[PDB]
Design a protein around this ligand. Structure first.
Ligand code: MET
Ligand SMILES: [Zn+2]
Length: 755
């Protein structure tokens, strides 16, 4: 009998109860006792759901009030001094590290979890760090194991392992020379103690996550697995199941071929082809947990194919040594498809969210065990086939159009220098031209009226209000003398869904929420089939903004890679194909914008780095090519005098890739730290605006501040190539904050314009 296994369950709650309670606590409306009661109710509900579905191996310690990695830092005392000097109880030290503490001290760094859409709080270490078990704070993994046990639910605790935990951390400000992994001998005793305590509580297995094995690791890091696991394994601890996800472990196979662990988990959804080689290092007795139900997307699993993978594993190691698992934690998928009331039922048939993936791992397990689940198999096969044959999935018009992609469709009519000559004649922009990135402070009035349009006012009262906001922002920008204006984006809720809703090939949920960080959740669009654009998406509001000013107005688009990476993608065609269809769809929008008089156009690609393949090699370089190419397919059709802008949230984004876009103008976050980067673009003729000030702050920089910053840039970068702008948009800043800061930026550029 083959077991089923789930690596973690999302904890936000089917109605977002976790968000409600944590925010009500942070605001001082709910007591800490209320908060902890609601956590217990969620964990119980989630454990019963998995038990009820028949899952054999059910996780604990996967729950968190903010972030699981941060919960480990509390547990092991990786807690910087600054957070400890306030009388704060453990849970509020937690929240302080997580989100900062204001009283009449900044949060720890937020980082993407691999190429997922989740962020974790970076483990931060100093020379002074003393690892030890922090027990007056309760021992969360023990407490939560014990809680499930009193429910009648035996669970498998999940903890991030010692190499991954250190390796993903970073040295604190006061210890810039410290190599986190050099702390391994100090943290291993604390892991051991924790594993002893879990065994004593009755845990017989622990899932110990070492996802850094899917990354490119130095040799001196790969050797630490033997060291760490030799020290942890023994008769006084539970059996350990070393768990990897999101990629390929084979280049690191030498590091784990001789570990004393009880078993391994691999992700055969992202990398099925690694099966033969990873199965070959299993020793006699070790188990193999085959990750075959996707923890990061929402498609109903193909039971035939998934069962074949499991069956290849069984054939290599034996049926008693194989487990059917989710590929990763279901943290990355929404809680429950049954909450969806709007979706067309034919589409819904193609989906499974977290709750449904529970039933899927059970059916697959039973199937390879030899139970008769014929009816589930046939129902599953019929769903798979309905999707594969649907007209939604396959649009011939879109397929034809893909056949037209080439270098020439992705190249501007003439090269930058000739384009510059025509753009200078057309706009006559001054030296140190000033502009912004797009969004302005979101007037409570407008966001009220948004909520009101959603019947209490009709479309035109909606138009008129959107339009007055635009006017306000435009007039504002004229007043302070900015050179290239924006419209403020008041009509836009979300930079991805705003486009997705206007594109063929997308579906949307009402409740398909996934945790992004702390209590902040996203509801991604779903790409269900071939993407195309039936009609103008942005033209109306850009035309209006350009009609009320003689300054040039930027149109504003979200790029193709970002739409792809912030949506749930199709799992039946590649990322590249999706991004190219989206590039072609945006190409039609660019055409319409340009035809209507909108001849300065910005494309925003904040998720470009997020999709970077986790290892170096062919896949990574292919990605960078197709990512730049889909941007070029969107933007390359325009006239030479049309000025194309590209905006990037990442600093220290790959200069080669920036160059590969051949945008007329590039804006980048740079208000943070090292000058060699600016030097990277000095022979590159196209223009660049190194973002001068942190948007995420609220503090007004002086004029002289702005000035000293340029002269650092100009000692590396030519003034003829240089734009002046903020780091990103100002959606989240305050109006008086914004008015003084922009006025200041402009007057600085004007003084440089004069001098
Ligand atoms: C996060 S990049 C998106 C930029 C967008 N145009 C803004 O200014 O809000
Ligand atoms: Zn940005």
């Amino acid at each position: 009998m083959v077991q089923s296994s789930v690596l973690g369950f999302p904890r936000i709650g089917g109605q977002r109860e976790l968000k409600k309670i944590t925010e009500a606590y942070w605001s001082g409306k709910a007591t800490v006792e209320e908060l902890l009661a609601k956590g217990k109710e969620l964990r119980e509900h989630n454990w019963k759901l998995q038990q009820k579905a028949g899952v054999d191996i059910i996780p604990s310690n996967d729950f968190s009030y903010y972030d699981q990695v941060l919960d480990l830092s509390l547990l092991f005392n990786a807690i910087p001094e600054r957070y400890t000097k306030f009388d704060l109880a453990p849970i509020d030290v937690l929240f302080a590290m997580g989100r900062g503490l204001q009283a009449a001290v900044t949060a720890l760094e937020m980082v993407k979890w691999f190429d997922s859409n989740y962020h974790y709080v970076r483990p931060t270490f100093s020379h002074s760090t003393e690892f030890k078990l922090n027990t007056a704070a309760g021992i969360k993994p023990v407490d939560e194991f014990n809680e499930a046990k009193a429910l009648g639910v035996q669970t498998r605790p999940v903890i991030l392992g010692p190499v991954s935990y250190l390796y993903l951390g970073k040295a604190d400000k006061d210890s810039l020379d410290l190599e986190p992994i050099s702390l391994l001998p100090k943290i291993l005793p604390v892991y051991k103690e924790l594993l002893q305590k879990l065994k004593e509580a009755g845990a017989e297995q622990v899932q110990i996550d070492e996802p850094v094995l899917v990354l490119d690791l130095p040799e001196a890091v790969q050797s630490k697995f033997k060291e760490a696991y030799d020290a942890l394994v023994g008769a006084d601890v539970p059996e350990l199941i070393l768990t990897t996800y999101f990629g390929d472990v084979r280049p690191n196979l030498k590091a784990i071929e001789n570990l004393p662990v009880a078993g391994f988990h691999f992700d055969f959804v992202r990398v099925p082809e690694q099966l033969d080689e990873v199965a070959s290092i299993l020793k006699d007795g070790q188990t193999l947990s085959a990750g075959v139900v996707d923890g990061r997307n929402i498609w109903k699993t193909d039971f035939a194919k998934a069962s074949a993978v499991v069956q290849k594993a069984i054939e290599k190691v034996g049926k008693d040594k194989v487990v059917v698992a989710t590929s990763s934690s279901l943290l990355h998928t929404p809680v429950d498809l049954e909450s969806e009331t709007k979706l067309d039922a034919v589409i819904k048939d193609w989906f499974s969210f977290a709750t449904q993936k529970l039933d899927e791992v059970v059916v697959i397990a039973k199937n390879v065990s030899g139970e008769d689940v014929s009816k589930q198999l046939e129902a599953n096969a019929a769903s798979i086939k309905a999707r594969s044959e649907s007209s939604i999935t396959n649009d011939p018009k879109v397929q034809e159009r893909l056949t037209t992609i080439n270098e020439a469709l992705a190249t501007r009519k003439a090269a930058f220098p000739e384009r510059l000559t025509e753009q200078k004649a057309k706009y006559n922009l001054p030296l140190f031209p000033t502009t912004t990135i797009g969004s302005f402070p979101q007037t409570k009035d407008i966001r009220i009226n948004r909520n009101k349009f959603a019947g209490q006012i009709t479309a035109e009262e909606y138009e008129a209000f959107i339009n007055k906001e635009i006017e306000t922002v435009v007039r504002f920008q004229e007043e302070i003398g900015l050179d290239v204006l924006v419209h403020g984006e008041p009509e836009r809720n979300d930079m991805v869904q705003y486009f997705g809703e206007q594109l063929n090939g997308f579906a949307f949920t009402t409740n398909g929420w996934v945790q992004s960080y702390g209590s902040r959740y996203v509801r991604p669009p779903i790409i269900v089939g071939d993407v195309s654009r039936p009609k103008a998406m942005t033209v109306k509001e850009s035309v209006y903004a350009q009609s009320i000013t003689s300054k040039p107005m930027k149109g504003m688009l979200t790029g193709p890679v970002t739409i792809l990476r912030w949506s749930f993608p199709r799992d039946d065609v590649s990322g590249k194909i999706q991004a190219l269809q989206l590039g072609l769809a945006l190409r039609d929008e660019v055409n319409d914008l340009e035809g209507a008089g909108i001849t300065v156009i910005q494309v925003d690609e904040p998720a470009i780095r997020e999709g970077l393949p986790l290892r170096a090699g062919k896949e990574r370089s292919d990605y960078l090519n197709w990512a730049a190419q889909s941007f070029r397919v969107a933007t390359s059709g325009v006239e030479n005098s049309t000025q194309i802008h590209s905006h990037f949230c990442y600093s220290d984004l790959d200069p080669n890739h920036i160059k590969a876009l051949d945008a007329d103008v590039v804006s980048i976050e740079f208000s943070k730290k090292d000058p060699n980067y600016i030097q990277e673009f000095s022979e590159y003729p196209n223009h660049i605006g190194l973002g001068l000030f942190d948007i995420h702050s609220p503090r007004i920089p002086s004029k002289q501040e702005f000035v000293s910053r340029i002269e650092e840039i100009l000692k590396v970068y030519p003034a003829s190539k240089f734009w002046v702008n903020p780091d990103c948009g100002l959606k989240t800043r305050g109006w008086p904050e914004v008015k003084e800061s922009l006025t200041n930026m402009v007057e600085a550029a004007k003084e440089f314009r004069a001098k």
